[PDB]
Structure formats: C-alpha cells, structure tokens
Design a protein around this ligand. Structure first.
Ligand SMILES: [Cl-]
Length: 116
C-alpha cells in the first residue's frame, strides 16, 4: 500500500491536478511526511485527486465505502476507525474541508493519510 499498479492508473489525473492547482512534488512529499499547511496548491490538489477517483462529491463529502474498498485489508479497521472520528468533513470550501480531514487523520492515525 499504495500498490505499484495504482500509480500508473493515477498518472494522468495526478498530472492534471498538479497543473490545475500549482502543486509541486515537494508539497506532496511534505504531506506524506506528515507536514500539512492550509495552502490551496496542496489542499486543492488533494481534493482534485479524491474527486478524480469518486472518493468525494461536489461538496467534499467522502464516499467512505469506496475509500474503504481501495485500502489494503490490514488498514481497513484503522481507516474505518479514523473516519468515524474524522467524518463528516467540514471547512470553508472543498479544499479546506480536505485539509481538515487530512489533519484529523494524521493526528489520529498517521499511516492512513498517504497522498499520491
Ligand atoms: Cl463527509
């Protein structure tokens, strides 16, 4: 997890989402080291990618079933647990909703919130 196959299937959406939002790979790496700031270039990137895979709707409500279904078996209990705490999402906008969600997951259970 993330399994290598996923990276090829996400490549085009990753590229578009970074281009749309001004995202750098260094920002993604930061999020993945647990450093998250409320900067739209990274927060809107995370929303963009979740939306590309139908994990969120037009108001950044999470499809928890689809999200669960994407994760490895050994993470799913921990993920369900973190989502019971961290959903529903709230924020000033779709990007900020996902930032708050990312914080909440990082604060509660580190290894769940990985961002491709
Ligand atoms: Cl939600």
């Amino acid at each position: 997890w993330v399994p290598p196959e996923v990276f090829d299937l996400v490549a085009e959406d990753k590229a578009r989402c970074m281009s749309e939002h001004g995202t750098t790979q260094a920002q993604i790496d930061d999020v993945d080291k647990g450093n998250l700031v409320n900067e739209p270039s990274i927060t809107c990137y995370m929303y963009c990618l979740l939306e590309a895979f139908s994990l969120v709707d037009d108001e950044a409500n999470v499809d928890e079933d689809i999200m669960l279904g994407l994760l490895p078996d050994q993470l799913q209990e921990r993920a369900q647990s973190v989502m019971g705490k961290c959903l529903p999402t709230s924020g000033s906008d779709n990007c900020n909703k996902i930032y708050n969600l990312a914080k909440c997951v990082q604060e509660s259970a580190p290894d769940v919130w990985f961002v491709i």
